[PDB]
Design a protein around this nucleic acid. Structure first.
Lengths: 122, 120, 209, 56, 114
RNA sequence: AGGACCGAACCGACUAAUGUCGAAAAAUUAGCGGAUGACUUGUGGCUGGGGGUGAAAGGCCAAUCAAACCGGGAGAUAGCU
RNA sequence: ACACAGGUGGUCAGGUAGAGAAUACCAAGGCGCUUGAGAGAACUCGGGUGAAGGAACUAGGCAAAAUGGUGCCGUAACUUC
RNA sequence: AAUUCCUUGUCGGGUAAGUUCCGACCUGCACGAAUGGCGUAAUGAUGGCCAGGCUGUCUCCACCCGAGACUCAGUGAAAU
RNA sequence: CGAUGUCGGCUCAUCACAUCCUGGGGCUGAAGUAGGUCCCAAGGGUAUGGCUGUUCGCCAUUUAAAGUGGUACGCGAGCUGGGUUUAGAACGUCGUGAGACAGUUCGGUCCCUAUCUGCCGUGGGCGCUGGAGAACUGAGGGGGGCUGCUCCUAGUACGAGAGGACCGGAGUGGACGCAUCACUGGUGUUCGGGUUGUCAUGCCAAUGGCACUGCCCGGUAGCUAAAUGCGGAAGAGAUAAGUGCUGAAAGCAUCUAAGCACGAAACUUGCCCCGAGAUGAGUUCUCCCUGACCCUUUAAGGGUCCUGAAGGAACGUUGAAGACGACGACGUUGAUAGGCCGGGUGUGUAAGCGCAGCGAUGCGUUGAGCUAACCGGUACUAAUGAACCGUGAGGCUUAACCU
């Protein structure tokens, strides 16, 4: 459950550490983003030596949510924070080289193969 | 909408409601018959009759637990010594409500609640 | 095709071999006995009237007792009838079991929804509440405006306002049938159905095939 | 919030048509003492279902 | 109800070990990736147990590399295969929700040694 | 030592809600300012209407003030309703 | 104007905790405020709690929430020191 | 600018986005030196803006506790 | 002018079509994707933020689109009061001055208990004709009608290449609506526990009152969303723009004059709900009543005695029904409510005793004790025998069959 103005941590090592969600994509009047929905974010503070600077708008994908995800058998997965991965605004293509922390398997959409491969767990 | 809820409010807060049943439970045990409004009498069946059930078996823990309700040593003495043995073979239903017209002051439906005793 | 009358019995879930859990509503569909068969010659339309359950002998009135005795059917609670599809026929006194749902996949369940009593516009029509602060005075959940001005001069019919909510019959359609148990008279349908536990439900095959 | 014309006595009576009270007309006779009393209520003297219940 | 209770009873499993909140537990769960089925191990601390029969469930919290992960398992679901207990926490509270705030040396609990 | 600081009594009234045929012809509830001073208060005096008093708003002068109240000129006058 | 949630000067002023005439619970003493009984709808008023987000509300962080004590360490720009 | 119509002057800072705010220029319609000019620590229930924490303000409301509203008995208004 | 409250915002809308999207078409300087323009079409849908009081506008990022207008520039007896537009004060400017300025700043009381119409709900009365209890037909009315992306067709048709379809099928989303509590959660001042101050039960121990439920930690049932299922149709009928077949007037040609075809989210139906007060008051099934006297202004007349059935109402216990009425279950030939027994759930190892320790405290008895609304049982208490209302075969005329 990520909506506008929400703080997110960064799972990758692109140099960003905290980002603000400014829009939820994928539908008109969409309220909040799910486990693996694409969102538009702005970086609020990053590494000075990183390739992404403060106050830049680029897409992102949620990988972890505090609210959690629901499994088909009724189980749920919950995390202590919300995390995302950075993107390129033209092709999804996570720019990071490695991603820290667990990643749920809900991102297996025949496309996030790069995210799951770099995921230390699942 | 109070679907399947139980417990009358009686236009009182929780603390006042608890005390009022506590006193009026003690009065019923002491006198074995009292006159009250019908809604009050019905709600008392759920606080007085459990007390008699507790008094069926006499023990230190039961005596302490009984005392914590009604906060009266006279009532606790009355239980476990008379009410207990009298209802030993009785499987609930220790009370009886009898409607007795309407109160003159405000036309409250009044009723007598009295233990199934006093057949002397 | 005809439906059946059953009673809602709580809810449960079924665990499949692959792991997924299916929430199912349990409907108790005992034998339904046909009490009257209608024909175009007399009634102008063809239907079968069925009964289910049992009733106290001293509680059924004489007019109802005679109606059941004519068909030789034991008295039951209430009466319901279903129109025929012209492709099947029935006889008075015949008993209909839940087995007819063995070959179906979607069903429509009709029942009386739970009664919420007098409900406000916010709860009834999902009206948006006004601000709780910033000067608002006694207008936190009020409906707001209900008309325009002199030019209409009236409130249009069908306006959304507070009133009775629930306690009307509603139909949930295209529900997957999960399991049918003839000997135990159970019908497991995936999903939730209108009404509370113990309420009478009407189950018929889905019409939106 | 306030009337523009005073309603007539005809409208007043029409509104009041539903204010009429209803008699109990359901007075039962005690089995033993034969005293009229409200159904499911004790008699004035303290009888119910024949047996005396108040003893006062 | 009798009908419901009988319906749930046939779906039970009798190989559910007895565990209490605060007990370190490793739960084996089934994982499917297209056509291959594998066993995945989730080890953590039981912080809450919900007893409702066929609807009974428990939640396990584990400290991952950076943040904690809480998973709620349905006890009688086929997904869970086995439950094993390593430690026996000496807690005296039904729900250990206070462990979320705590971290580091303050998240450890004593041993029942019973 | 202090027109010093925090804070009750006491004095005042910055914000909000309630109340507007109110409990009340300006109040209540929760916060709020001063609180040894240019402070506050009891009792008794003095200043009287083109006048008083005013750390000055045209403020206050018996719930009435860009000229108080009462009686009189007076049945003022009204090309107006 | 009322048997009116307002106003009205002075004196005495105990116990436990507390710096305290604050505050909580009590003693002496005095009271339950002159309409009641039910039910437990919308909605209004006074309050309690709340998933994920955290000012995106709004003219405006209005209102709420939050901070809140004692001892020790430590404490910037500027300055009339 | 408590002063500026044209005007949201021009550039920069702050925001993803700033008719507000801060800094600089002067084309000062119509600043200006005791009806005082420019600075100024401290002070302010003073105006504007930003940040952290905090939250039902809000996305989007849900439940609950009390007093009314509703029914019964008694008394019994008002504007129009 | 003996008073029609004015700009924005919020809530709630409704209509027009000069259509923003979706739908159907003509032409194209239409290769395809993507366009331009015009015609038909109002079923549904038709943003979130920064700046400003702003509408507007600029800017940022979304969507299939972020349509134009009417409705007292819709809506203050529905809300706010930021702008404007009282009294205070200041700046610039004008005036000797009091003061003034669609010049600019700081501050500045928004009343109403609903009689009528209207609307949303819910009842009583009577009618529908002998009465009563049920189940229906359906005139008529309302609700719903939105759509993105991915894959297959296919990398096909097209095209020098770059690029890349039409038609049809499948899957998965957003927004909206209905239902529900099995799951994940919220609430749970009626359940259990921890703990601070103080008072009390003679005192210790153990408990209760008060301090916002004193402050907190969990939490049953209900209600509930963020939770979980389902829905938008397909099909048919008659059509709009448009495309036609045959075909004369007019030897030809021509969609039209006769005749025959197709043709859209529009219209009628199909889906869901209300519905015989549909005074045009409908249909079917079942049940109950078939005793006597008199009177007259001898009438579908009135009066008296005896009988009052089906059923209803009333009263009681009540409900996942409810403002009150109403609606549902039950009233002993009984599980309707309460209690009781067992279970479940929740909280979490009661009190007492014993042991270890100087003590706080710990261990054993003990996963104990206590448990609201839940589940299955049990007449233990309360649902009294009766009274009350409701009758006694149901008009006239005509038609058809028995007599």
């Amino acid at each position: 459950m990520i909506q506008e103005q929400t703080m997110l941590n960064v799972a990758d090592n692109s140099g960003a550490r905290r980002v603000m969600c400014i829009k939820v994509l994928g539908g008109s009047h969409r309220r909040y983003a799910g486990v693996g929905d694409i969102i538009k974010i702005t970086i609020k503070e990053a590494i000075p030596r990183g390739k992404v600077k403060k106050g830049d708008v680029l897409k992102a994908v949620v990988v972890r949510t505090k609210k959690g995800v629901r499994r088909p058998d009724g189980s749920v997965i919950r995390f202590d924070g919300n995390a995302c991965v950075l993107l390129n605004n033209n092709s999804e293509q996570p720019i990071g080289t490695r991603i820290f922390g667990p990643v749920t398997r809900e991102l297996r959409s025949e496309k996030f193969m790069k995210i799951i491969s770099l995921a230390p767990e699942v | 909408m109070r679907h399947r809820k139980s417990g009358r409010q009686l236009n009182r807060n929780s603390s006042h409601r608890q005390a009022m049943f506590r006193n009026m439970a003690g009065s019923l045990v002491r006198h074995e018959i009292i006159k009250t409004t019908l809604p009050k009498a019905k709600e008392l069946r759920r606080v007085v009759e459990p007390l008699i059930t507790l008094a069926k078996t006499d023990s230190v823990a039961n005596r302490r637990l009984a005392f914590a309700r009604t906060r009266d040593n006279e009532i606790v003495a009355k239980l476990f010594n008379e009410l207990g043995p009298r209802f030993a073979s009785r499987a609930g239903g220790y009370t009886r409500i009898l409607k007795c017209g309407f109160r003159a002051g405000d036309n409250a439906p009044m009723a007598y609640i009295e233990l199934v005793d006093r057949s002397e | 095709m005809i439906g059946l009358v059953g009673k809602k019995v709580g809810m449960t879930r079924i665990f499949t071999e692959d792991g997924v859990s299916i929430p199912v509503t349990v409907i108790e569909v005992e034998a339904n006995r046909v009490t009257q068969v209608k024909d175009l010659a007399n009634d102008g339309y063809r239907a079968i009237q069925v009964t289910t359950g049992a009733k106290k002998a001293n509680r059924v009135t004489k007019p109802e007792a005679g109606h059941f005795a004519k068909a030789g059917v034991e008295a039951g609670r209430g009466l319901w009838e279903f129109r025929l599809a012209e492709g099947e026929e029935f006889t008075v006194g015949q008993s209909i079991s839940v087995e007819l749902f063995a070959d179906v996949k979607k069903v429509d369940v009709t029942g009386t929804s739970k009664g919420k009593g007098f409900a406000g516009t916010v709860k009834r029509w999902n009206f948006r509440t006004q601000d709780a602060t910033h000067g608002n005075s006694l207008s936190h959940r009020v409906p707001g405006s209900i008309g325009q001005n002199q030019t209409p001069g009236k409130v249009f019919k069908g306006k959304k306002m507070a009133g009775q909510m629930g306690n009307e019959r509603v139909t949930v359609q295209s529900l997957d049938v999960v399991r049918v148990d003839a000997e135990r008279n159970l019908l497991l349908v995936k999903g939730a159905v209108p009404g509370a536990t113990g309420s009478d439900l009407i189950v018929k095959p889905a019409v939106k095939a | 919030a306030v009337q523009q014309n005073k309603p007539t006595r005809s409208k007043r009576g029409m509104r009041r048509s539903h204010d009429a009270l209803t008699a109990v007309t359901s007075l039962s006779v005690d089995k033993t003492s034969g005293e009229k009393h409200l159904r499911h209520h004790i008699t004035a003297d303290g009888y119910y279902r024949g047996r005396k219940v108040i003893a006062k | 109800s009798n009908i419901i209770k009988q319906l749930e009873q046939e779906q039970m499993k009798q190989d559910v070990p007895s565990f209490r909140p605060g007990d370190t537990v490793e739960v084996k769960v089934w994982v499917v990736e297209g056509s291959k089925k594998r066993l995945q191990a989730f080890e953590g601390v039981v912080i809450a147990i919900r007893n409702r029969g066929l609807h009974s469930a428990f939640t396990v919290r584990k400290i991952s590399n950076g943040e904690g992960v809480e998973r709620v398992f349905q006890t009688h679901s086929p997904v869970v295969d086995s439950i094993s207990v390593k430690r026996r926490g000496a807690v005296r509270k039904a729900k250990l929700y206070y462990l979320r705030e705590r971290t580091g040396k303050a998240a450890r609990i004593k041993e029942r040694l019973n």
